[PDB]
């Protein structure tokens, strides 16, 4: 029932077709990303880790329609609470496991932020978020093993906001790439 890519290259090809138009079937993209069976022989060239924080590694620019990247989570690495600046955001597990915590948006007043959902993403699972869904934080569940995830953002974006869990106040953050196309960045 679901088109199953046999390789990461197949998946990218399919994604080029699915984002060529103006409409994006979210459930269709999600099912097809999920159907790809993570194969580290195919993506190890992108899996470039850092000791202290997670890294973002650009895989494909999707003809301007999306960014496809691989995120490498060291032992214990996690993100801040953040938004996704009005884009579609798909995240699929390639190795290990991430805990996703969804947060409600803050309003004007200062307040501890409210959790709306908490889950662990299973092997090969693809999750979806946008700003209407909520904010989230994601974290490697393991302090002894890495996690690796495949992210697709459409349209692409280079800035987002990080949120202080104690108050709801936010800061603009510029996103940076650790590598592009398997090549380390300055
Ligand atoms: Fe995110």
UniProtKB/Swiss-Prot annotation:
Its cofactor is Fe(2+); Ni(2+); Zn(2+). Keywords: Dioxygenase, Iron, Metal-binding, Oxidoreductase, Thioether bond. Binds 1 Fe(2+) cation per subunit. Zn(2+) can be used to a much lesser extent. Ni(2+) can be used to a lesser extent. The keyword Signal does not apply. Pathway: Organosulfur biosynthesis; taurine biosynthesis; hypotaurine from L-cysteine: step 1/2. Changing residue 89 to S: Reduces enzyme activity and iron incorporation by 50%. Zinc incorporation increased by 20%. GO terms for cellular component: cytosol. Highly expressed in liver and placenta. Low expression in heart, brain and pancreas. Also detected in hepatoblastoma Hep-G2 cells. Induction: In hepatoblastoma Hep-G2 cells, down-regulated by phorbol 12-myristate 13-acetate (PMA). There is a cross-link at residues 89-153 (3'-(S-cysteinyl)-tyrosine (Cys-Tyr)). Belongs to the cysteine dioxygenase family. Catalyzes the oxidation of cysteine to cysteine sulfinic acid with addition of molecular dioxygen. This is Cysteine dioxygenase type 1. The gene is CDO1.
């Amino acid at each position: 029932e679901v088109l199953k890519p046999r390789t990461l290259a197949d998946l990218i090809r399919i994604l080029h077709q699915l984002f060529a138009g103006d409409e994006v079937n979210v459930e269709e993209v999600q099912a097809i990303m999920e159907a790809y069976e993570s194969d580290p022989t195919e993506w190890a060239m992108y899996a470039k880790f850092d000791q202290y924080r997670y890294t973002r590694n650009l895989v494909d620019q999707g003809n301007g329609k999306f960014n496809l990247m691989i995120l490498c989570w060291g032992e214990g690495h996690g993100s801040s609470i953040h938004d996704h600046t009005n884009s579609h955001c798909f995240l699929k597990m390639l190795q290990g496991n991430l805990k996703e915590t969804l947060f409600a948006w803050p309003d004007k007043k200062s307040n501890e932020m409210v959790k709306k959902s908490e889950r662990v993403l299973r092997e090969n699972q693809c999750a979806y978020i946008n700003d209407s869904v909520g904010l989230h934080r994601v974290e490697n569940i393991s302090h002894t093993e890495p996690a690796v995830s495949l992210h697709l953002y459409s349209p692409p974006f280079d800035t987002c906001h990080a949120f202080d869990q104690r108050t709801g106040h936010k800061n603009k953050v510029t996103m940076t790439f650790h590598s592009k196309f398997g090549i380390r960045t300055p």
